[PDB]
Ligand binder design. Structure first.
Ligand SMILES: CNCc1ccc(-c2cccs2)cc1
Ligand SMILES: CNCc1ccc(-c2cccs2)cc1
Ligand code: NA
Lengths: 306, 306
């Protein structure tokens, strides 16, 4: 029993974190096999942050301009290349701690663990979700660029996010490990705004299913809804549209609890209308949207109980 | 920017987790030096649990009855003994991954990171506080016993919790690493219950300071109060008493933000007496009490653990 925002154990990623220095700028890099991945903005200078020409900046660099430190060891850079917005520094040592891994680009609503790091050393681990507007709501201070987000579902680390910048509203923007930004953002200092954010409806429903699995039914009701009527209501509360894909995705949790997906939709509709009336759901007074259906199945018992 | 519930990086602890099997029961152990620590209840059948005599149950066992796996590698048990409610299995090999560590017993209100494990394999990490009622609001399924809680104090892992049981309300109980239970609990199937819990006042205040540091200031007001006056309110709202030591601990945050502790207590008084009036603080509609003053300072400064 219980339900917590749970990250993956971070050790497999800790063993890959390095420090990359270029000029006066230091940030984090990710060392896998003989490659160190980091944000290409490490090569920018102070008077050229708004419209850097990365090709022109990089061609001027030699391998020895990049200082890469792994623990107390300096690694030797033997090559470099740029892929989209990431820099790939080839080094003369394979990381002996490289885990089984892959690179996966995720979709809005997906969750992942973030290993916040400064100067190549890990600070803490927490869970994030890719918001519908392609930002994340992280905890990142100056020096955290190059920190990564990942999942580790079956002993293989799937890297999905590398941290690049903070938008004026205090939310965070970055890339996959191929260097393609999530959302319509660019690695330039010119002020950018994220789309209005919305609530991840499918995740709220999953978390209501978690609450039932853990023994709480107070918020259910005798009603149901069509999918279209649910969406017409939920959008008035800034909730994301629920698709038939989402309905299908919720099938297993519906089967476990005996609560049809559209019935749980009717419960959500009522909660949006009524609030909680001084009650909580899984210890929250707000509707939680950063647990996916997959997260709930991984964390909760397979036996609806209590 | 940003403030998130964050766990310590777990890698140093992941290298210490093993699987311990006795009879039909498998749970987790902590392998440090040449000793594996696990709950003494591992030696019990389901009839034994009604009224266990642990010393008598242990003499019937010998070393070969304890099957210990570190990953895919068997560990040979060469001795066995009990300290309070933990079994200490001497093995023939010191763990080469043993970190710098100490065993510490924590106080209610202190937070720690839990590395949830099953079959000796780390599955998730999350942040807990030892509640005033000496339970923790964990997330644990069958097979999680022996999972550990810890802090990292500079360069040293401070182990503070080993998981033993779930209480009827779905909260959790366990021991320090010397096998002394937190709270008035026993490792025997008898009627047990969590006591009425209270809110950790000093931690709420710490979190309000974190909110202000992150630009969330709507709850500030012109008023101040006195300790005796505030403690009357805390008592009324099932908050722990605030002591002068708590005030002193929060001194740094008072100086940084310009809001004296009793000034923030005036804010907390007003929130307890009037609610949040539809607003949130750091994205929460509840007053969060599982961040210590140290957690706030740490996250707000980027402290690191290589
Ligand atoms: C295998 N031995 C690991 C270990 C090493 C050092 C220490 C400490 C040294 C000083 C304070 S704690 C504790 C454990
Ligand atoms: C393999 N031993 C099975 C077992 C025995 C006792 C208990 C507990 C009873 C009360 C608190 S924990 C749990 C498991
Ligand atoms: Na005040």
């Amino acid at each position: 029993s219980g339900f917590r925002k749970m990250a993956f154990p971070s050790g497999k990623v800790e063993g890959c974190m390095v420090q990359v220095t270029c000029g006066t700028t230091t940030l984090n890099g990710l060392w896998l096999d003989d490659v160190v991945y980091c944000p290409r903005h490490v090569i920018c200078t102070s008077e050229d942050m708004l419209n850097p020409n990365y090709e022109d900046l990089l061609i001027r660099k030699s391998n020895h301009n990049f200082l890469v430190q792994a623990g107390n060891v300096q690694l030797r850079v033997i090559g470099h290349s740029m892929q989209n917005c990431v820099l790939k520094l080839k080094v003369d040592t394979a990381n002996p701690k490289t885990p089984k891994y892959k690179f996966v680009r995720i979709q809005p609503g997906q969750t992942f663990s973030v290993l916040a790091c400064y100067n190549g050393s890990p600070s803490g681990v927490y869970q994030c979700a890719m918001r519908p507007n392609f930002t994340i709501k992280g905890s990142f201070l100056n020096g955290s660029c190059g920190s990564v987000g990942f999942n580790i579902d079956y002993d293989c680390v799937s890297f999905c996010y590398m941290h690049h910048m903070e938008l004026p509203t205090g939310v965070h923007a970055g890339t996959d490990l191929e260097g393609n930004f999530y959302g319509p953002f660019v690695d330039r200092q010119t002020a950018q705004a994220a789309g209005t954010d919305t609530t991840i409806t499918v995740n709220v429903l999953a978390w209501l299913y978690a609450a039932v699995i853990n023994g709480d039914r107070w918020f259910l009701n005798r009603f149901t809804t069509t999918l279209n009527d649910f969406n017409l209501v939920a959008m008035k509360y800034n909730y994301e549209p629920l698709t038939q894909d989402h309905v299908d995705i919720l099938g297993p949790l519906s089967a476990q609890t005996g609560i049809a997906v559209l019935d749980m939709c009717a419960s959500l509709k009522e909660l949006l209308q009524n609030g909680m009336n001084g009650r909580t759901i899984l210890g929250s007074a707000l509707l939680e949207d950063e647990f996916t259906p997959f997260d709930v199945v991984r964390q909760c018992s397979g036996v609806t109980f209590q």
